[PDB]
Amino acid sequence: PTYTLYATFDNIGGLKARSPVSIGGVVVGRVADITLDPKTYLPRVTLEIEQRYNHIPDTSSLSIRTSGLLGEQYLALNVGFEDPELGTAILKDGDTIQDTKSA
């Protein structure tokens, strides 16, 4: 199964529904839906991440990037670095990835 994460971009470019979310090239989730935020009119992406990948730090970032010859776009989730002395919080169902890089 999966859990939900949100992320806001200034521009989603060629991103679409079912666009893959990957970590190190490995698909770990997918874009479930894309909506304009009703109050800010900023694109918000709704992600469905496979539940086995449930130790993602909230310091992680999302980048829109392009794969192969067809110009297919995807989300690169870069696992942010945490420091056990400082104790970084883990992303949970319904949480938002705050750090994003648009296209």
Binding site residues, a copy of itself, CB under 8 A? 9-15, 23-26, 28, 34-36, 38-43, 52-53, 55-56, 67-71, 79, 102-103
- For the bound state, the minimum distance from the C-beta of residue 93 to a copy of itself, rounded and expressed in Å, comes to 17
Query: What are the residues whose beta carbons fall under 8 Å from the beta carbon of 60, sequence distance 6 or more?
Result: 77, 78, 79, 80, 91, 97, 99
- Closest to a copy of itself by CB, 4 vs 53, is 53
- Closest to a copy of itself by CB, 70 vs 86, is 70
- For the bound state, the minimum distance from the C-beta of residue 25 to a copy of itself, rounded and expressed in Å, comes to 4
- Closest to a copy of itself by CB, 17 vs 98, is 17
Please provide residue 70's backbone torsions phi and psi, each rounded to the nearest 5 degrees.
-100, 0
Cα→Cα distances 8→30, 82, 96, 101, 102, Å: 15, 22, 8, 9, 9
